């Protein structure tokens, strides 16, 4: 859409989201990091 608002949008929740996963992520890279 060429006519959308091309700016950051205020009036959004500025607080932490408590509806998040509190457990560890098993889908993470388990190998040593060469970089």
């Amino acid at each position, epitope marked *: 859409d*060429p*006519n*959308a*608002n*091309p*700016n*950051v949008d205020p009036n959004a929740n500025p607080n932490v989201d408590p509806n998040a996963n509190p457990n560890v992520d098993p889908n993470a890279n388990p190998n040593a990091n060469p970089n």
Partner: antibody, heavy 121, light 112 residues
């Protein structure tokens, strides 16, 4: 105060590239989108491109799509316009403008000084 | 140039002149706004009117404008010496892939 300064213009032969920039100061660069516009000598204005604040969305005019590339670096407060294979029809004074949206359409509240790009042989 | 403007307008100092901006059913008559810019001979365009009635702090009270149907106009009262400039009307066209579309541009002449 909003300060928009541009540089990188000059005289370039057709068929090759040239790069422009628009430095910004006096406002948070990351919270606003930016525009590129050009004005041919003796003509009116012609919109060129728009980039979103996060850089996700890029839009171009039909006459410049596929040749012009717009980019921004939020850590340097500088906007870039990469022009490749310039034609004689691309000789115009290029301005950068800060995007603003009122109800259903956009406008530019503050504009840059502008720079002139010459494409001739 | 989807927006059509007269090529040049003129009037005596201190009188009222109007700069029209004619569009179609896709740009002005489709429900979109019209913004105006004033370009001095030696500088970049400066914002004049946004929201079809609103002006920034820098713009004086003389400038005003309105829209109706597919037509929009800019009204100038009390022409002065420094009012000589090119005035462009900007909107958005539904039938293109660009955020802004500009008019031809009208040159205002003060017969001082």
């Amino acid at each position: 105060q909003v300060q928009l300064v541009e540089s990188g213009g000059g005289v370039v032969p057709p068929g090759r590239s040239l790069r422009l920039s628009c430095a910004t100061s006096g406002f948070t660069f990351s919270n606003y989108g930016m525009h590129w516009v050009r004005q041919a000598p003796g003509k009116g204005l012609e919109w060129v491109a728009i980039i979103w604040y996060d850089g996700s969305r890029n839009f171009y005019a039909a006459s410049v799509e596929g040749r012009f590339t717009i980019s921004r670096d939020n850590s340097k407060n500088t906007l870039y316009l990469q022009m490749n294979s310039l034609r004689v029809e691309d000789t115009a004074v290029y301005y950068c403008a800060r995007a603003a949206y009122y109800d259903t359409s956009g406008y530019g509240d503050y504009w840059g000084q502008g720079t002139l790009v010459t494409v001739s042989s | 140039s989807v927006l059509t403007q007269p090529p040049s307008v003129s009037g005596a100092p201190g009188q009222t002149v109007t700069i029209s901006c004619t569009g179609g059913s896709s740009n002005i008559g489709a429900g979109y706004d019209v913004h105006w810019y004033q370009q001095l001979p030696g500088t970049a365009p400066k914002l004049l009117i946004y929201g079809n009635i609103n002006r920034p702090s820098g713009v004086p009270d003389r400038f005003s404008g309105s829209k109706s149907g597919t037509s929009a106009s800019l009204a100038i009262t009390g022409l002065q010496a420094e009012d000589e400039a090119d005035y462009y009307c900007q909107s958005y066209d539904r039938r293109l892939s660009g955020s802004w579309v500009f008019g031809g541009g009208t040159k205002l002449t003060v017969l001082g």
